[PDB]
mmCIF file of all heavy atoms in Angstrom:
data_model
loop_
_atom_site.group_PDB
_atom_site.id
_atom_site.type_symbol
_atom_site.label_atom_id
_atom_site.label_comp_id
_atom_site.label_asym_id
_atom_site.label_seq_id
_atom_site.Cartn_x
_atom_site.Cartn_y
_atom_site.Cartn_z
ATOM 1 N N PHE A 1 25.195 0.698 6.905
ATOM 2 C CA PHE A 1 25.281 1.660 5.827
ATOM 3 C C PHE A 1 24.158 1.841 4.806
ATOM 4 O O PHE A 1 24.303 1.615 3.584
ATOM 5 C CB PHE A 1 26.609 1.555 5.096
ATOM 6 C CG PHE A 1 27.088 2.882 4.576
ATOM 7 C CD1 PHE A 1 27.978 3.651 5.324
ATOM 8 C CD2 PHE A 1 26.588 3.398 3.378
ATOM 9 C CE1 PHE A 1 28.367 4.928 4.892
ATOM 10 C CE2 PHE A 1 26.966 4.664 2.933
ATOM 11 C CZ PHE A 1 27.862 5.433 3.700
ATOM 12 N N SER A 2 23.028 2.261 5.342
ATOM 13 C CA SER A 2 21.873 2.633 4.530
ATOM 14 C C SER A 2 21.108 3.490 5.487
ATOM 15 O O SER A 2 21.062 3.187 6.676
ATOM 16 C CB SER A 2 20.999 1.446 4.117
ATOM 17 O OG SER A 2 19.769 1.955 3.597
ATOM 18 N N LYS A 3 20.532 4.577 4.996
ATOM 19 C CA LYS A 3 19.758 5.437 5.881
ATOM 20 C C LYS A 3 18.262 5.171 5.658
ATOM 21 O O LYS A 3 17.406 5.702 6.383
ATOM 22 C CB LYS A 3 20.065 6.908 5.581
ATOM 23 C CG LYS A 3 21.522 7.326 5.921
ATOM 24 C CD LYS A 3 21.810 7.139 7.411
ATOM 25 C CE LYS A 3 23.309 7.277 7.749
ATOM 26 N NZ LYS A 3 23.622 6.659 9.092
ATOM 27 N N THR A 4 17.971 4.318 4.685
ATOM 28 C CA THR A 4 16.584 4.052 4.324
ATOM 29 C C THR A 4 16.066 2.617 4.467
ATOM 30 O O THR A 4 14.930 2.320 4.073
ATOM 31 C CB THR A 4 16.323 4.568 2.908
ATOM 32 O OG1 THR A 4 17.094 3.824 1.946
ATOM 33 C CG2 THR A 4 16.724 6.031 2.820
ATOM 34 N N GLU A 5 16.891 1.742 5.040
ATOM 35 C CA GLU A 5 16.491 0.331 5.252
ATOM 36 C C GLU A 5 16.517 -0.054 6.739
ATOM 37 O O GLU A 5 17.208 0.592 7.579
ATOM 38 C CB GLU A 5 17.399 -0.610 4.424
ATOM 39 C CG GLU A 5 17.293 -0.469 2.858
ATOM 40 C CD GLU A 5 18.089 -1.559 2.079
ATOM 41 O OE1 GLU A 5 19.125 -2.042 2.609
ATOM 42 O OE2 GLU A 5 17.698 -1.931 0.931
ATOM 43 N N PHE A 6 15.728 -1.064 7.110
ATOM 44 C CA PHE A 6 15.737 -1.543 8.469
ATOM 45 C C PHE A 6 15.658 -3.035 8.323
ATOM 46 O O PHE A 6 15.101 -3.529 7.340
ATOM 47 C CB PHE A 6 14.598 -0.979 9.340
ATOM 48 C CG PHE A 6 13.191 -1.441 8.948
ATOM 49 C CD1 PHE A 6 12.636 -2.610 9.493
ATOM 50 C CD2 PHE A 6 12.417 -0.662 8.087
ATOM 51 C CE1 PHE A 6 11.304 -2.999 9.186
ATOM 52 C CE2 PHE A 6 11.095 -1.041 7.769
ATOM 53 C CZ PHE A 6 10.555 -2.214 8.330
ATOM 54 N N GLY A 7 16.245 -3.743 9.275
ATOM 55 C CA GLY A 7 16.245 -5.180 9.204
ATOM 56 C C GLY A 7 15.390 -5.872 10.238
ATOM 57 O O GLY A 7 15.298 -5.489 11.423
ATOM 58 N N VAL A 8 14.767 -6.963 9.788
ATOM 59 C CA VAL A 8 13.964 -7.750 10.688
ATOM 60 C C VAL A 8 14.484 -9.179 10.580
ATOM 61 O O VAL A 8 14.633 -9.708 9.483
ATOM 62 C CB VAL A 8 12.457 -7.781 10.304
ATOM 63 C CG1 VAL A 8 11.744 -8.721 11.243
ATOM 64 C CG2 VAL A 8 11.837 -6.404 10.423
ATOM 65 N N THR A 9 14.731 -9.768 11.728
ATOM 66 C CA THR A 9 15.181 -11.149 11.787
ATOM 67 C C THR A 9 13.966 -12.037 11.928
ATOM 68 O O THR A 9 13.324 -12.085 12.956
ATOM 69 C CB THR A 9 16.132 -11.369 12.959
ATOM 70 O OG1 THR A 9 17.299 -10.593 12.694
ATOM 71 C CG2 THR A 9 16.514 -12.845 13.081
ATOM 72 N N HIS A 10 13.655 -12.708 10.824
ATOM 73 C CA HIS A 10 12.507 -13.607 10.758
ATOM 74 C C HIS A 10 13.022 -15.039 11.006
ATOM 75 O O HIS A 10 14.242 -15.295 11.031
ATOM 76 C CB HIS A 10 11.885 -13.536 9.342
ATOM 77 C CG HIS A 10 11.251 -12.217 8.993
ATOM 78 N ND1 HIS A 10 9.943 -11.911 9.314
ATOM 79 C CD2 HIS A 10 11.695 -11.195 8.226
ATOM 80 C CE1 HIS A 10 9.602 -10.773 8.735
ATOM 81 N NE2 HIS A 10 10.647 -10.321 8.068
ATOM 82 N N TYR A 11 12.101 -15.980 11.139
ATOM 83 C CA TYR A 11 12.516 -17.365 11.378
ATOM 84 C C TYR A 11 13.346 -17.825 10.189
ATOM 85 O O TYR A 11 14.216 -18.693 10.322
ATOM 86 C CB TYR A 11 11.280 -18.270 11.528
ATOM 87 C CG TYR A 11 10.493 -18.468 10.230
ATOM 88 C CD1 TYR A 11 10.822 -19.484 9.314
ATOM 89 C CD2 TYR A 11 9.450 -17.618 9.909
ATOM 90 C CE1 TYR A 11 10.112 -19.644 8.081
ATOM 91 C CE2 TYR A 11 8.738 -17.746 8.676
ATOM 92 C CZ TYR A 11 9.070 -18.748 7.768
ATOM 93 O OH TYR A 11 8.398 -18.787 6.544
ATOM 94 N N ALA A 12 13.102 -17.236 9.030
ATOM 95 C CA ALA A 12 13.810 -17.664 7.830
ATOM 96 C C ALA A 12 15.084 -16.870 7.586
ATOM 97 O O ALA A 12 15.711 -17.029 6.546
ATOM 98 C CB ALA A 12 12.879 -17.549 6.586
ATOM 99 N N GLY A 13 15.424 -16.004 8.541
ATOM 100 C CA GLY A 13 16.598 -15.171 8.393
ATOM 101 C C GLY A 13 16.284 -13.674 8.312
ATOM 102 O O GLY A 13 15.119 -13.219 8.282
ATOM 103 N N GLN A 14 17.348 -12.882 8.194
ATOM 104 C CA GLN A 14 17.144 -11.452 8.136
ATOM 105 C C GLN A 14 16.725 -10.957 6.787
ATOM 106 O O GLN A 14 17.211 -11.409 5.724
ATOM 107 C CB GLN A 14 18.408 -10.690 8.554
ATOM 108 C CG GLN A 14 18.158 -9.192 8.772
ATOM 109 C CD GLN A 14 19.479 -8.471 9.104
ATOM 110 O OE1 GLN A 14 20.423 -8.505 8.310
ATOM 111 N NE2 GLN A 14 19.538 -7.852 10.274
ATOM 112 N N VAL A 15 15.800 -10.002 6.823
ATOM 113 C CA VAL A 15 15.323 -9.361 5.609
ATOM 114 C C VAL A 15 15.453 -7.854 5.815
ATOM 115 O O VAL A 15 15.019 -7.311 6.861
ATOM 116 C CB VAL A 15 13.820 -9.651 5.339
ATOM 117 C CG1 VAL A 15 13.407 -8.954 4.019
ATOM 118 C CG2 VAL A 15 13.597 -11.177 5.288
ATOM 119 N N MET A 16 16.058 -7.195 4.837
ATOM 120 C CA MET A 16 16.200 -5.742 4.908
ATOM 121 C C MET A 16 15.055 -5.139 4.081
ATOM 122 O O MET A 16 14.865 -5.498 2.907
ATOM 123 C CB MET A 16 17.523 -5.272 4.272
ATOM 124 C CG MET A 16 18.775 -5.918 4.875
ATOM 125 S SD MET A 16 18.823 -5.652 6.600
ATOM 126 C CE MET A 16 18.771 -3.951 6.614
ATOM 127 N N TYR A 17 14.349 -4.195 4.676
ATOM 128 C CA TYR A 17 13.201 -3.508 4.032
ATOM 129 C C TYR A 17 13.506 -2.015 3.754
ATOM 130 O O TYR A 17 13.955 -1.299 4.672
ATOM 131 C CB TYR A 17 12.018 -3.572 4.978
ATOM 132 C CG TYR A 17 11.521 -4.992 5.230
ATOM 133 C CD1 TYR A 17 11.911 -5.673 6.357
ATOM 134 C CD2 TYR A 17 10.700 -5.652 4.283
ATOM 135 C CE1 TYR A 17 11.513 -7.009 6.581
ATOM 136 C CE2 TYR A 17 10.281 -6.963 4.478
ATOM 137 C CZ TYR A 17 10.684 -7.641 5.624
ATOM 138 O OH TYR A 17 10.277 -8.920 5.859
ATOM 139 N N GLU A 18 13.221 -1.569 2.536
ATOM 140 C CA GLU A 18 13.425 -0.176 2.083
ATOM 141 C C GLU A 18 12.133 0.609 2.415
ATOM 142 O O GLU A 18 11.049 0.189 2.022
ATOM 143 C CB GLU A 18 13.712 -0.230 0.569
ATOM 144 C CG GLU A 18 13.537 1.082 -0.177
ATOM 145 C CD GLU A 18 14.394 2.178 0.415
ATOM 146 O OE1 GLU A 18 15.614 1.925 0.538
ATOM 147 O OE2 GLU A 18 13.857 3.254 0.780
ATOM 148 N N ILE A 19 12.247 1.720 3.148
ATOM 149 C CA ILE A 19 11.079 2.513 3.576
ATOM 150 C C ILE A 19 10.401 3.400 2.521
ATOM 151 O O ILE A 19 9.330 3.954 2.754
ATOM 152 C CB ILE A 19 11.508 3.431 4.765
ATOM 153 C CG1 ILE A 19 10.336 3.715 5.687
ATOM 154 C CG2 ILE A 19 12.157 4.684 4.236
ATOM 155 C CD1 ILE A 19 10.012 2.566 6.598
ATOM 156 N N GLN A 20 11.035 3.573 1.385
ATOM 157 C CA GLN A 20 10.508 4.435 0.346
ATOM 158 C C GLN A 20 9.008 4.199 0.055
ATOM 159 O O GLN A 20 8.588 3.070 -0.156
ATOM 160 C CB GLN A 20 11.348 4.233 -0.910
ATOM 161 C CG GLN A 20 10.942 5.041 -2.117
ATOM 162 C CD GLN A 20 11.892 4.822 -3.284
ATOM 163 O OE1 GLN A 20 11.502 4.948 -4.447
ATOM 164 N NE2 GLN A 20 13.147 4.504 -2.979
ATOM 165 N N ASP A 21 8.216 5.274 0.068
ATOM 166 C CA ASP A 21 6.788 5.201 -0.233
ATOM 167 C C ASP A 21 5.842 4.485 0.739
ATOM 168 O O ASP A 21 4.640 4.340 0.450
ATOM 169 C CB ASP A 21 6.603 4.609 -1.618
ATOM 170 C CG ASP A 21 7.251 5.452 -2.677
ATOM 171 O OD1 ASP A 21 7.389 6.682 -2.468
ATOM 172 O OD2 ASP A 21 7.626 4.886 -3.715
ATOM 173 N N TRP A 22 6.338 4.047 1.890
ATOM 174 C CA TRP A 22 5.450 3.389 2.835
ATOM 175 C C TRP A 22 4.279 4.268 3.292
ATOM 176 O O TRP A 22 3.146 3.781 3.435
ATOM 177 C CB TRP A 22 6.241 2.906 4.032
ATOM 178 C CG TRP A 22 6.996 1.656 3.720
ATOM 179 C CD1 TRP A 22 7.616 1.321 2.537
ATOM 180 C CD2 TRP A 22 7.247 0.590 4.616
ATOM 181 N NE1 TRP A 22 8.255 0.100 2.664
ATOM 182 C CE2 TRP A 22 8.040 -0.366 3.928
ATOM 183 C CE3 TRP A 22 6.890 0.340 5.931
ATOM 184 C CZ2 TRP A 22 8.479 -1.542 4.532
ATOM 185 C CZ3 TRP A 22 7.325 -0.849 6.537
ATOM 186 C CH2 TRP A 22 8.113 -1.762 5.826
ATOM 187 N N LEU A 23 4.506 5.557 3.507
ATOM 188 C CA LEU A 23 3.367 6.400 3.934
ATOM 189 C C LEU A 23 2.258 6.389 2.881
ATOM 190 O O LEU A 23 1.082 6.257 3.201
ATOM 191 C CB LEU A 23 3.819 7.857 4.193
ATOM 192 C CG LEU A 23 4.770 7.963 5.382
ATOM 193 C CD1 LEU A 23 5.153 9.439 5.639
ATOM 194 C CD2 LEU A 23 4.124 7.371 6.609
ATOM 195 N N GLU A 24 2.637 6.539 1.620
ATOM 196 C CA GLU A 24 1.670 6.522 0.525
ATOM 197 C C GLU A 24 0.978 5.173 0.443
ATOM 198 O O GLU A 24 -0.235 5.078 0.241
ATOM 199 C CB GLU A 24 2.378 6.784 -0.803
ATOM 200 C CG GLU A 24 2.339 8.211 -1.260
ATOM 201 C CD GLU A 24 0.926 8.686 -1.481
ATOM 202 O OE1 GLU A 24 0.290 9.120 -0.505
ATOM 203 O OE2 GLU A 24 0.446 8.606 -2.633
ATOM 204 N N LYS A 25 1.760 4.110 0.574
ATOM 205 C CA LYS A 25 1.193 2.782 0.505
ATOM 206 C C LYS A 25 0.219 2.456 1.626
ATOM 207 O O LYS A 25 -0.601 1.561 1.486
ATOM 208 C CB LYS A 25 2.336 1.736 0.463
ATOM 209 C CG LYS A 25 3.141 1.775 -0.844
ATOM 210 C CD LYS A 25 4.258 0.697 -0.865
ATOM 211 C CE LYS A 25 4.998 0.676 -2.204
ATOM 212 N NZ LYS A 25 5.837 -0.560 -2.346
ATOM 213 N N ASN A 26 0.277 3.181 2.737
ATOM 214 C CA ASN A 26 -0.619 2.851 3.824
ATOM 215 C C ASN A 26 -2.017 3.483 3.678
ATOM 216 O O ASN A 26 -2.908 3.142 4.430
ATOM 217 C CB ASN A 26 0.029 3.262 5.153
ATOM 218 C CG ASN A 26 -0.560 2.543 6.334
ATOM 219 O OD1 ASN A 26 -0.907 1.360 6.232
ATOM 220 N ND2 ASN A 26 -0.666 3.235 7.485
ATOM 221 N N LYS A 27 -2.177 4.368 2.693
ATOM 222 C CA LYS A 27 -3.433 5.101 2.446
ATOM 223 C C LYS A 27 -4.257 4.370 1.431
ATOM 224 O O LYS A 27 -3.760 4.027 0.377
ATOM 225 C CB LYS A 27 -3.153 6.493 1.892
ATOM 226 C CG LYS A 27 -2.023 7.236 2.587
ATOM 227 C CD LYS A 27 -2.296 7.322 4.086
ATOM 228 C CE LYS A 27 -2.847 8.680 4.478
ATOM 229 N NZ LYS A 27 -3.084 8.709 5.953
ATOM 230 N N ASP A 28 -5.538 4.208 1.730
ATOM 231 C CA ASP A 28 -6.435 3.440 0.889
ATOM 232 C C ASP A 28 -7.812 4.121 0.784
ATOM 233 O O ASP A 28 -8.825 3.507 1.097
ATOM 234 C CB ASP A 28 -6.622 2.084 1.570
ATOM 235 C CG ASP A 28 -7.109 1.027 0.641
ATOM 236 O OD1 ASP A 28 -6.711 1.049 -0.542
ATOM 237 O OD2 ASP A 28 -7.880 0.164 1.103
ATOM 238 N N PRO A 29 -7.873 5.384 0.360
ATOM 239 C CA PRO A 29 -9.210 5.989 0.293
ATOM 240 C C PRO A 29 -9.839 5.860 -1.082
ATOM 241 O O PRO A 29 -9.122 5.841 -2.082
ATOM 242 C CB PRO A 29 -8.924 7.446 0.634
ATOM 243 C CG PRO A 29 -7.664 7.653 -0.163
ATOM 244 C CD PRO A 29 -6.832 6.410 0.217
ATOM 245 N N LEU A 30 -11.170 5.774 -1.133
ATOM 246 C CA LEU A 30 -11.863 5.693 -2.412
ATOM 247 C C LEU A 30 -13.008 6.718 -2.360
ATOM 248 O O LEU A 30 -13.837 6.659 -1.467
ATOM 249 C CB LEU A 30 -12.425 4.312 -2.613
ATOM 250 C CG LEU A 30 -13.239 4.163 -3.889
ATOM 251 C CD1 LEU A 30 -12.390 4.414 -5.151
ATOM 252 C CD2 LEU A 30 -13.820 2.761 -3.878
ATOM 253 N N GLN A 31 -13.014 7.650 -3.298
ATOM 254 C CA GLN A 31 -14.036 8.711 -3.350
ATOM 255 C C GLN A 31 -15.451 8.139 -3.501
ATOM 256 O O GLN A 31 -15.689 7.313 -4.367
ATOM 257 C CB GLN A 31 -13.720 9.660 -4.510
ATOM 258 C CG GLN A 31 -12.502 10.569 -4.291
ATOM 259 C CD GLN A 31 -12.718 11.634 -3.215
ATOM 260 O OE1 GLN A 31 -13.850 11.967 -2.875
ATOM 261 N NE2 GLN A 31 -11.622 12.198 -2.703
ATOM 262 N N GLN A 32 -16.404 8.587 -2.673
ATOM 263 C CA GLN A 32 -17.767 8.043 -2.760
ATOM 264 C C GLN A 32 -18.397 8.353 -4.120
ATOM 265 O O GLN A 32 -19.176 7.554 -4.617
ATOM 266 C CB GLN A 32 -18.681 8.571 -1.637
ATOM 267 C CG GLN A 32 -19.995 7.784 -1.555
ATOM 268 C CD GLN A 32 -20.849 8.156 -0.360
ATOM 269 O OE1 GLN A 32 -21.384 9.264 -0.283
ATOM 270 N NE2 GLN A 32 -20.981 7.227 0.583
ATOM 271 N N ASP A 33 -18.069 9.484 -4.733
ATOM 272 C CA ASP A 33 -18.675 9.778 -6.034
ATOM 273 C C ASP A 33 -18.274 8.733 -7.098
ATOM 274 O O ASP A 33 -18.960 8.594 -8.095
ATOM 275 C CB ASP A 33 -18.277 11.152 -6.534
ATOM 276 C CG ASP A 33 -19.265 12.245 -6.117
ATOM 277 O OD1 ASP A 33 -20.247 11.946 -5.398
ATOM 278 O OD2 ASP A 33 -19.027 13.407 -6.518
ATOM 279 N N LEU A 34 -17.126 8.065 -6.917
ATOM 280 C CA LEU A 34 -16.724 7.028 -7.895
ATOM 281 C C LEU A 34 -17.654 5.855 -7.685
ATOM 282 O O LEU A 34 -18.171 5.309 -8.650
ATOM 283 C CB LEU A 34 -15.280 6.596 -7.665
ATOM 284 C CG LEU A 34 -14.352 7.682 -8.224
ATOM 285 C CD1 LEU A 34 -12.879 7.394 -7.809
ATOM 286 C CD2 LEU A 34 -14.472 7.723 -9.759
ATOM 287 N N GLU A 35 -17.903 5.472 -6.429
ATOM 288 C CA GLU A 35 -18.823 4.373 -6.196
ATOM 289 C C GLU A 35 -20.221 4.699 -6.749
ATOM 290 O O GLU A 35 -20.900 3.811 -7.317
ATOM 291 C CB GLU A 35 -18.914 4.055 -4.701
ATOM 292 C CG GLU A 35 -17.534 3.906 -4.086
ATOM 293 C CD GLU A 35 -17.583 3.431 -2.688
ATOM 294 O OE1 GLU A 35 -17.866 4.277 -1.809
ATOM 295 O OE2 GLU A 35 -17.345 2.223 -2.466
ATOM 296 N N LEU A 36 -20.659 5.947 -6.576
ATOM 297 C CA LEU A 36 -21.987 6.359 -7.075
ATOM 298 C C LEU A 36 -22.014 6.203 -8.600
ATOM 299 O O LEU A 36 -23.000 5.766 -9.191
ATOM 300 C CB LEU A 36 -22.290 7.816 -6.710
ATOM 301 C CG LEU A 36 -22.477 8.000 -5.211
ATOM 302 C CD1 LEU A 36 -22.830 9.461 -4.927
ATOM 303 C CD2 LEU A 36 -23.618 7.093 -4.724
ATOM 304 N N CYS A 37 -20.920 6.557 -9.244
ATOM 305 C CA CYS A 37 -20.852 6.406 -10.692
ATOM 306 C C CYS A 37 -21.057 4.946 -11.101
ATOM 307 O O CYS A 37 -21.947 4.601 -11.903
ATOM 308 C CB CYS A 37 -19.462 6.874 -11.205
ATOM 309 S SG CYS A 37 -19.209 6.674 -13.002
ATOM 310 N N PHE A 38 -20.231 4.060 -10.551
ATOM 311 C CA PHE A 38 -20.317 2.668 -10.941
ATOM 312 C C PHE A 38 -21.568 1.937 -10.477
ATOM 313 O O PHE A 38 -21.966 0.951 -11.115
ATOM 314 C CB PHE A 38 -19.054 1.928 -10.489
ATOM 315 C CG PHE A 38 -17.861 2.258 -11.333
ATOM 316 C CD1 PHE A 38 -17.204 3.492 -11.194
ATOM 317 C CD2 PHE A 38 -17.483 1.403 -12.365
ATOM 318 C CE1 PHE A 38 -16.210 3.884 -12.064
ATOM 319 C CE2 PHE A 38 -16.476 1.776 -13.259
ATOM 320 C CZ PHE A 38 -15.837 3.007 -13.124
ATOM 321 N N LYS A 39 -22.149 2.380 -9.363
ATOM 322 C CA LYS A 39 -23.402 1.775 -8.891
ATOM 323 C C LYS A 39 -24.489 1.933 -9.972
ATOM 324 O O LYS A 39 -25.462 1.194 -9.964
ATOM 325 C CB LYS A 39 -23.883 2.433 -7.579
ATOM 326 C CG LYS A 39 -23.093 1.989 -6.357
ATOM 327 C CD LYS A 39 -23.492 2.662 -5.008
ATOM 328 C CE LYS A 39 -22.402 2.346 -3.935
ATOM 329 N NZ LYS A 39 -22.567 2.894 -2.517
ATOM 330 N N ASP A 40 -24.317 2.881 -10.894
ATOM 331 C CA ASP A 40 -25.304 3.116 -11.962
ATOM 332 C C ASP A 40 -24.929 2.470 -13.302
ATOM 333 O O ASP A 40 -25.529 2.768 -14.357
ATOM 334 C CB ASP A 40 -25.507 4.615 -12.178
ATOM 335 C CG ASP A 40 -26.973 4.988 -12.314
ATOM 336 O OD1 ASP A 40 -27.679 4.936 -11.284
ATOM 337 O OD2 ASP A 40 -27.425 5.333 -13.431
ATOM 338 N N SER A 41 -23.920 1.599 -13.277
ATOM 339 C CA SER A 41 -23.498 0.919 -14.501
ATOM 340 C C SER A 41 -24.628 0.111 -15.126
ATOM 341 O O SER A 41 -25.433 -0.467 -14.425
ATOM 342 C CB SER A 41 -22.355 -0.072 -14.190
ATOM 343 O OG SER A 41 -22.134 -0.894 -15.327
ATOM 344 N N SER A 42 -24.616 0.024 -16.435
ATOM 345 C CA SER A 42 -25.575 -0.801 -17.154
ATOM 346 C C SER A 42 -25.078 -2.259 -17.214
ATOM 347 O O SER A 42 -25.773 -3.122 -17.756
ATOM 348 C CB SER A 42 -25.759 -0.282 -18.574
ATOM 349 O OG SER A 42 -24.542 -0.371 -19.293
ATOM 350 N N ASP A 43 -23.887 -2.536 -16.670
ATOM 351 C CA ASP A 43 -23.367 -3.907 -16.692
ATOM 352 C C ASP A 43 -23.703 -4.693 -15.434
ATOM 353 O O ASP A 43 -23.475 -4.245 -14.309
ATOM 354 C CB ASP A 43 -21.859 -3.936 -16.918
ATOM 355 C CG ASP A 43 -21.339 -5.347 -17.035
ATOM 356 O OD1 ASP A 43 -21.114 -6.004 -15.981
ATOM 357 O OD2 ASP A 43 -21.184 -5.808 -18.189
ATOM 358 N N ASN A 44 -24.261 -5.878 -15.660
ATOM 359 C CA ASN A 44 -24.729 -6.752 -14.614
ATOM 360 C C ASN A 44 -23.661 -7.126 -13.609
ATOM 361 O O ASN A 44 -23.939 -7.197 -12.424
ATOM 362 C CB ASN A 44 -25.347 -8.000 -15.266
ATOM 363 C CG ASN A 44 -25.854 -9.010 -14.254
ATOM 364 O OD1 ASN A 44 -25.427 -10.189 -14.258
ATOM 365 N ND2 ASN A 44 -26.775 -8.572 -13.376
ATOM 366 N N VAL A 45 -22.435 -7.368 -14.052
ATOM 367 C CA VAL A 45 -21.412 -7.712 -13.082
ATOM 368 C C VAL A 45 -20.880 -6.459 -12.369
ATOM 369 O O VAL A 45 -20.662 -6.468 -11.156
ATOM 370 C CB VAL A 45 -20.278 -8.452 -13.753
ATOM 371 C CG1 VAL A 45 -19.195 -8.839 -12.693
ATOM 372 C CG2 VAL A 45 -20.848 -9.692 -14.445
#
């Protein structure tokens, strides 16, 4: 009785996982212009 969870039986027992936002969470892009901005920082670190 959940349309948004799936269960996985791990060695430590079953864990139910909620799928909400997984597609968004799998995306990891970073705009090159942001890197260009920070590459010009006046801070040494």
Side-chain angles (χ1 to χ4, degrees):
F1 213 95
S2 167
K3 294 299 169 199
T4 66
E5 295 187 330
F6 67 89
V8 175
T9 295
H10 293 274
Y11 69 87
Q14 191 183 59
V15 181
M16 304 304 303
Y17 295 98
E18 162 57 53
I19 209 77
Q20 179 177 152
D21 299 333
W22 283 37
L23 294 182
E24 264 299 85
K25 292 181 176 194
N26 201 36
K27 316 304 260 180
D28 200 35
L30 177 62
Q31 288 291 340
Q32 192 173 68
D33 268 2
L34 283 171
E35 310 187 281
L36 292 182
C37 178
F38 286 75
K39 284 178 192 180
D40 224 72
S41 169
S42 63
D43 184 278
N44 179 237
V45 181

